[PDB]
Amino acid sequence: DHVVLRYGGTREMVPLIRHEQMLDMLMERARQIVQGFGNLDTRNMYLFRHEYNSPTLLYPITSASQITSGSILEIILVDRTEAAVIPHVVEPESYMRPTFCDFCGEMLTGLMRQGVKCKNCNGNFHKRCSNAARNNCG
Amino acid sequence: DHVVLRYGGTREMVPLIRHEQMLDMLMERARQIVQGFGNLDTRNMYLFRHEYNSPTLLYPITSASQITSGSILEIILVDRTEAAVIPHVVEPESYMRPTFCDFCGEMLTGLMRQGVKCKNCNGNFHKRCSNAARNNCG
Ligand SMILES: [Zn+2]
Ligand SMILES: [Zn+2]
Ligand SMILES: [Zn+2]
Ligand SMILES: [Zn+2]
């Protein structure tokens, strides 16, 4: 029973308890992830989840209740200068050993053509995942 | 009875009605401001207000009620690659003709030293304003 945090180009699993300070704790993991990149100021750090069935859309998390198990939460420093997205350019791909979707962390499933592969950063994603918000090609 | 919208390096006044679709309308002005910069996609556009007495902090707007008259709302495309802030480097300044705070739009008041002036972008701000979130030096 997890959630996934994402920042920079890094994902991390965090066990999802239902408990009053669940959100406090996710936030401090988030803060720790970002200082993992380098003392970036953190006062306007927010988590945004991807919408059910529509991963191009983000919703800000305000109460612990909006966190549902399995959700992908984005760590976003909202005070910080906007810059152009870098999208994966992607085409279908069949996989012969079990491989995981580089964005969401769950397994590509199916017989053939289990996901898409990006030509420039070589990642492996579900089609629904290859263009999720904040899945930038680094 | 206004609010201020900000995007890019531009501020705009919008009359604040209390009415069910007040937020709908601010959002579509916001969208129009951003396409003023160039067909940037807009599905993850959010407004954030600056906190009372603490302009370095932003809070996302979710219901029309969080909008209070006079507030400075930031227009933020949250799906979009983070980038380092560019802060004003600023020192006090006395003003001899009435001049407005370039960030918030209200007048510098006082007798001497009514605000601060930035050496590189030459702007005029209240001290509380010279380092508000998203008041980047362009
Ligand atoms: Zn890629
Ligand atoms: Zn996936
Ligand atoms: Zn400046
Ligand atoms: Zn001001």
Author numbering:
A (entry chain A), B (entry chain A): 12 to 149
Q: What does the primary publication say about this deposited structure?
A:
Protein kinase D is a serine-threonine kinase comprising two N-terminal C1 domains, a PH domain and a C-terminal kinase domain belonging to the Ca2+/calmodulin-dependent kinase (CAMK) family. PKD signaling is tightly controlled by the lipid second messenger diacylglycerol (DAG), which in cells is produced by phospholipase C (PLC) downstream of either GPCR or receptor tyrosine kinase signaling. DAG recruits PKD via its two C1 domains to specific membranes in the cell, such as the plasma membrane and the TGN, where PKD is reportedly active. A second requirement for PKD activation is the phosphorylation of two serine residues (Ser738 and Ser742 in human PKD1) in the activation loop of the kinase domain.
To determine the structure of this module, a construct comprising the N-terminal and C1a domain of the C. elegans PKD homolog DKF-1 was purified and crystallized. Crystals diffracted to 2.2 Å, and the structure could be solved by experimental single anomalous dispersion phasing using the anomalous scattering of the Zn2+ ions in the C1a domain. The crystal structure reveals a dimeric assembly of the protein, in which the dimer interface sits on a crystallographic axis. Dimerization is mediated by the N-terminal domain, which adopts a ubiquitin-like fold. The dimerization interface on the ULD is mostly composed of hydrophobic residues. Using the structure of the isolated ULD dimer (residues 12–98) and the PDBePISA server, an interface area of 751 Å2 and a solvation free energy (ΔG) of −5.4 kcal/mol were calculated for the dimerization interface. To validate the dimerization interface observed in the crystal structure, we mutated the central hydrophobic phenylalanine to a negatively charged glutamate (F59E), the rationale being that two negatively charged residues in the interface should repel each other. Indeed, the F59E mutation converted the ULD and ULD–C1a into exclusive monomers. Aside from ULD dimerization, the structure also revealed an intramolecular interaction between the ULD and its corresponding C1a domain. This interface, in combination with the dimerization interface, gives rise to a unique arrangement of the C1 domains, with their respective DAG binding sites pointing in almost exactly opposite directions and contains three highly conserved residues in the ULD, Arg17, Arg22, and Glu85, that form a contiguous surface on the domain outside of the dimer interface.
